[PDB]
Write a protein that binds this ligand. Sequence first.
Ligand SMILES: O=C(O)[C@H]1C[C@H](O)CN1
Ligand SMILES: O=C(O)[C@H]1C[C@H](O)CN1
Ligand SMILES: O=C(O)[C@H]1C[C@H](O)CN1
Ligand SMILES: O=C(O)[C@H]1C[C@H](O)CN1
Lengths: 523, 527
Amino acid sequence: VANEPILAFSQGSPERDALQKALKDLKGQTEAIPCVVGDEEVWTSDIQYQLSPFNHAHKVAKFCYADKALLNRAIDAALAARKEWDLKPMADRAQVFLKAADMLSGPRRAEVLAKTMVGQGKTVIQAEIDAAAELIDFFRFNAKFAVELEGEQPISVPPSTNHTVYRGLEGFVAAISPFNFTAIGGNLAGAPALMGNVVLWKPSDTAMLASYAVYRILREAGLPPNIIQFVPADGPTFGDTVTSSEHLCGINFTGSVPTFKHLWRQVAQNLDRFRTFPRLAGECGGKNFHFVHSSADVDSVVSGTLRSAFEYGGQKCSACSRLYVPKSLWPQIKGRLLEEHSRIKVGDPAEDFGTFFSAVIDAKAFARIKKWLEHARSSPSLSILAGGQCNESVGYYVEPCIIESKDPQEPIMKEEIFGPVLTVYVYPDDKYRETLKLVDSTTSYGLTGAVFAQDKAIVQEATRMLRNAAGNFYINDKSTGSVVGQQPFGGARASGTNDKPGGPHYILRWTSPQVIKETHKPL
Amino acid sequence: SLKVANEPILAFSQGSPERDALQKALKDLKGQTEAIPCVVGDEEVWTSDIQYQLSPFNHAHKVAKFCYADKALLNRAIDAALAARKEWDLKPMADRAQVFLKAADMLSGPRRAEVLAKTMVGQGKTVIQAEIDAAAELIDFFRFNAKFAVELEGEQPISVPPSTNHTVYRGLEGFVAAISPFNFTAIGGNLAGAPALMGNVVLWKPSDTAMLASYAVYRILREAGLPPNIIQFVPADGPTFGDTVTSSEHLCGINFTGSVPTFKHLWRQVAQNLDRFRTFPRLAGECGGKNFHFVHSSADVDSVVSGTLRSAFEYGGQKCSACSRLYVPKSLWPQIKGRLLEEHSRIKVGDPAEDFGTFFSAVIDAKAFARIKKWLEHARSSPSLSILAGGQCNESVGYYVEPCIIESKDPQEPIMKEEIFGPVLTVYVYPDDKYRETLKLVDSTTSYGLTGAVFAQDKAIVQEATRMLRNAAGNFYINDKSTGSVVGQQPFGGARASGTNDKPGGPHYILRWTSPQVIKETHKPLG
Ligand SMILES: O=C(O)[C@H]1C[C@H](O)CN1
Ligand SMILES: O=C(O)[C@H]1C[C@H](O)CN1
Ligand SMILES: O=C(O)[C@H]1C[C@H](O)CN1
Ligand SMILES: O=C(O)[C@H]1C[C@H](O)CN1
């Protein structure tokens, strides 16, 4: 398999026309999205709404939270389907995901893009790289990795033959997905299912519309009933229920550090009830850096940093939120950042394809981000250089904000904001080595980071010094936009378990191998 | 790339160089006690907490005097290991691999007799059980893991213009605690050695009852070029060690083999301490089993009897993989019972250093002896159990237990469920026409999922049992015994209560001990 092409959406192109039609189709719509257990559409009385982030008067979906009883029925129904699904040849399971990938590439592309735009607030290009390219790539590449894994067999020596069976995990896997990438939800539920597992998928409330579109595509591509249960739910209720089940065998999570730690602690408390040791996989975000050396290409620093910090409103686990600049380059970088900032268009991405980014995801995110802007207006070490405005009357709109910090270890340099808020620390040129140490030591995180420099010795030194500051490390490129099969994604420190989805080893977390030795002569 | 093959098993025939060398090594050890220090860096350290390892078959012989590291020494060992880690992690994988390939060659040749003899005298193994463990399996772990690790670096992502992508297989940031069991010298070497190979630094707490052979392996690794502070040799009280390592902000992994309750305890301690760690520690555990041999009416009776006696009684049944429950159809029970009892009468229990005709020797220690004796007493009292052969034990000289065969009328009796770790085989006879229902009981009776075997010549029965027992055994055997997995041929491990199933012996085990970084370098200015 190869990576899915990124379409250009130029005027008069088939994909631009198809996307505009899909957006028109969605403009006034609310989809009633049920829980799905097997083939049954189930409604509880716990009704919830997903709002369009840039137009919160538009309820894009009405859904409901599964209660503990419904979640337990979903577990039981999934467990009863597991053995036959696990016994299927790997290639037959992979065929479901290859078919889904082709549907997403072609006839369903405009739908999943438009649902990601209207429901999660993405622009055309951000939806395209996510709900199409990244998701399609997860399905195709994981299918390839899984079929290839079957070829990894042990040595046989007569008179015995040895065979490894890549069993699914025994029990069910809980997939808990975040709002910010449609593709992550598809992968969190889809990768374990590919490996013969059955899954309770709790999608993010704020990504419900696009998540259900992916679910339906999987069912239409041939995924049998009870392999993935579509079970929106209150977060704590879902976590309490799955960690209380004797049949839990895995949690595939992406989201905040405290939530992942809480789930880890609940599993540990309940070890005596489980049939086997559950496998926890978590990617937990970052406080990601762009570090500039005086030899850097300033134009690349400026465009890469504006994109990394502000695309999708900075709502990426990989987004740059701390920029380190040498004093010698600061007049150039400050002047260019502030000028380009005034040309950033914030607005409705469905109505204006010129939009750079749109509203943040929901009222809670808006309130958190506003608190950080208020902090930047208060702190003696922080100065807002550009932006700082927000307005939630129509959508959850936050302008891009550029802040300078005189304190390299200010809280704003340490804590993940998940909004369009870039903090810059200007360091003296002769203190670049001490500043590299600050990049490594200042935060709890280890996810992404970039070095911009045209000096080979500097790049080699910075690569060594930052070895554990970033699991995805970039030289003369921006910190966002990892591509499946090219930059397997993840990091350690507080950023999670670093299972590298996007590479060939991720699927090994979702199989528990059995080795069969058959001896052909008497003992 | 690198070419490795399994280490050949030697015959130890009369007059052979290896038999003479082993006899000399045993003669050397017979009256000796080695004083084994803790080793931090290159420093030999003694604490006041003096302990002794006894020879299981002659417990008046203290084979080693060692000491338990105190919390101060454990924390000093952590600090010194962390100060050596970055340079070790930055070494090329092939340079780290060379240490383990050199150690493997030393174990294969000049040190073979030493590590075999120390495993025999200190752990109670016979010649052949020591040979397959302290030589073959350990040598194979070192060579095969070296090959797997060197080849892993060739697993690289796709590059597309204008950028080049490379994966760096970093060691984990922090230190790894390796906690090993008494019953295989090889497991201790792998638990500490595999993480070190991958660029980690390690505190190795060996088993008290395998101390002599464990230190011999440690010294060989150092002589093979392992730098100081990469593996700290820190015997310690178990709970004291676990408390210390799980309280360190720098813990990044625990590589464990032993009992289920100990692993769960460590898992809970890590979870309680999550807010102080720099990263999420990786716990790996293999935790034993209640392993089965299932016999179909079409089985080869001779294979059933020899394979079951070996699996149940070699090394006194003190194997995570040992058969402790035998399921026999009523039609074959007369043939199998008669042959089991006849062959049982020929099993020689004795001193393995003095009599190479010994089948197996004493169990490991007084605690194991006392537990096994309580199970034998339970077999005498229970109305569902009857002792068919064996049943006696005597600890006046060593911890000696006769091999014991018990028949249960209850397939759910506690003796069919709980791991004894002794030479105690329980037999359940089932009606031929209920083989399918009995297969379900094989699957559901215990909490474990480690090893199991089916003996049958009917291909359809084999296929049916293989499907029905898919999650009852991570190492499943068709017409062979449930013990004796070989590195690179049967990667070893299982799920359910048997642990995390990371399959040491196969190519994926080392992935638990690396945290990859991907570097993208872009060669054109951004637009
Ligand atoms: O993220 C996006 O949609 C595009 C729009 C702007 O040109 C920056 N990148
Ligand atoms: O921004 C990135 O690097 C990728 C990784 C994650 O799957 C979401 N997008
Ligand atoms: O385990 C051993 O040492 C050998 C002794 C007996 O012949 C069966 N195997
Ligand atoms: O008995 C066995 O199968 C192997 C597995 C473990 O390493 C100890 N010996």
